[PDB]
Amino acid sequence: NTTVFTRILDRLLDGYDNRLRPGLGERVTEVKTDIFVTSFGPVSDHDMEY
Amino acid sequence: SNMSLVKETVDRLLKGYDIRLRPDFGGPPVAVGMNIDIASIDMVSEVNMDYTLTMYFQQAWRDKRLSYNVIPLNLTLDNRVADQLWVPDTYFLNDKKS
Numbered sequence: 097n098t099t100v101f102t103r104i105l106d107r108l109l110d111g112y113d114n115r116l117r118p119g120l121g122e123r124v125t126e127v128k129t130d131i132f133v134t135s136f137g138p139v140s141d142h143d144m145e146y
Numbered sequence: 147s148n149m150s151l152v153k154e155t156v157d158r159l160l161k162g163y164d165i166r167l168r169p170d171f172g173g174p175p176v177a178v179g180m181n182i183d184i185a186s187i188d189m190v191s192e193v194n195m196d197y198t199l200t201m202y203f204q205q206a207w208r209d210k211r212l213s214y215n216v217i218p219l220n221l222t223l224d225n226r227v228a229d230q231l232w233v234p235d236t237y238f239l240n241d242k243k244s
């Protein structure tokens with residue numbers, strides 16, 4: 097089924113423009129965000145950074 | 147559809163576009179307006195005689211070849227199309243690492 101999967105992935109980017117967001121003039125894009133902090137690094141006091 | 151119309155417009159704009167030539171290559175100079183939105187000045191070192199600043203450096207010019215009169219909205223394209231337009235060769239003379 098590698099042929100069928102390749103034909104799906106090829107039909108998927110057929111005529112795709114990656115310079116236009118989904119719903120460019122007809123809607124507003126809704127990006128749902130999430131964060132999983134794997135490690136809270138060392139807080140440097142001199143540079144006031146973390 | 148509106149999306150297909152915009153895609154056709156953009157493809158027409160970038161077709162036959164010469165990046166080697168600035169706007170008005172054989173005419174008057176192009177006017178590039180600068181803006182700077184300084185986010186922070188991090189460190190002012192006396193031992194290296196330098197200072198680090200983070201800014202939102204914006205430039206605005208007028209390219210007649212990227213002019214469209216089909217859609218009435220101000221297009222915002224992906225940041226990867228800037229590799230296919232002409233952008234002025236601005237450099238900071240007294241920078242060391244940026």
Ligand SMILES: *[C@@H]1O[C@H](CO)[C@@H](O)[C@H](O)[C@H]1NC(C)=O
Pocket residue numbers: 218219220
């Ligand atoms: C495009 O930008 C100009 C200047 O910022 C503004 O006057 C105009 O309303 C904008 N167009 C749209 C469709 O918002």
